[PDB]
Design a protein around this ligand. Sequence first.
Ligand SMILES: Nc1nc2c(ncn2[C@@H]2O[C@H](COP(=O)(O)OP(=O)(O)NP(=O)(O)O)[C@@H](O)[C@H]2O)c(=O)[nH]1
Length: 304
Amino acid sequence: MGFFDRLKAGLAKTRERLLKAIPWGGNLEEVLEELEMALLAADVGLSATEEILQEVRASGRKDLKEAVKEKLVGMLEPDERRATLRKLGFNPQKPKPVEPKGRVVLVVGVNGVGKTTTIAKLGRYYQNLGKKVMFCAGDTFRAAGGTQLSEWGKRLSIPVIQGPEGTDPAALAYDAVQAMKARGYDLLFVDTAGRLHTKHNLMEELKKVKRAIAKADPEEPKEVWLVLDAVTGQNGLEQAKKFHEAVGLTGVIVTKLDGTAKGGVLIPIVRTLKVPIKFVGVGEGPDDLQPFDPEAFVEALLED
Ligand SMILES: Nc1nc2c(ncn2[C@@H]2O[C@H](COP(=O)(O)OP(=O)(O)NP(=O)(O)O)[C@@H](O)[C@H]2O)c(=O)[nH]1
């Protein structure tokens, strides 16, 4: 319960079509059939679905339902260690806290996916874990109404490195790291432009920003997080590929899970990018941005 409730609520649209209604009592032939449709309807994809079936049908010689759960969780965990600790019984009440590998987190993704809002929630999250957090408003470009990262910073008391619209994004991020160092901050999130059809090639700007961060601190950024909208589609995964090829993702944040019945998309995402989902977005609330936990996610896909 508690956050678990918020997760189940966020996955309700995906869950209540067929997943929860699966008749785990009938003769396999029916159940597995219903299972394949439920998966495909949730956007798990044919590839991962036919593998799940194999894993269960061929193998899966334990409890039918549990076999499914274990297989789905296995598909969501890119890290062998955690997969192992899980199999060994590790299953704490609430998911462990996501610790950035370093001090700088470069945030990327296409315009509109919710990068700005996601960073603000991340600031809160980390602040509540006692980190001194700083923001860099690397997307000086587009504002057009909405709420700037700049306004979010004042509200959380998080300083925002920013410059006049048009300011060199790379020089901003450089100043941002310098500032984070001199003032002794624990974490810096660098927001970035997300428009793929301007006169300035997005991927190239991005690489110039990551390079600037490195010039300031040769170890950074230790995290490159792509934000993906669960409502987009497979084009968004293709874009993901380009972002990965351009800057090397270390993680993925999936937002707007509450707005779709295709939440099963997380499986294809992790299988394609082979990086972990760090946080999942279950709504437009402050604490709606939660640390990802495969076990919990899978449970919410099937239960409640
Ligand atoms: N329902 C839902 N909405 C979300 C989630 N995350 C972000 N959003 C919403 O998505 C919209 C775009 O957010 P924003 O942070 O402005 O996006 P951007 O990707 O930063 N766009 P811009 O380039 O215009 O600054 C907002 O209305 C925001 O609340 C989520 O997990 N669920």
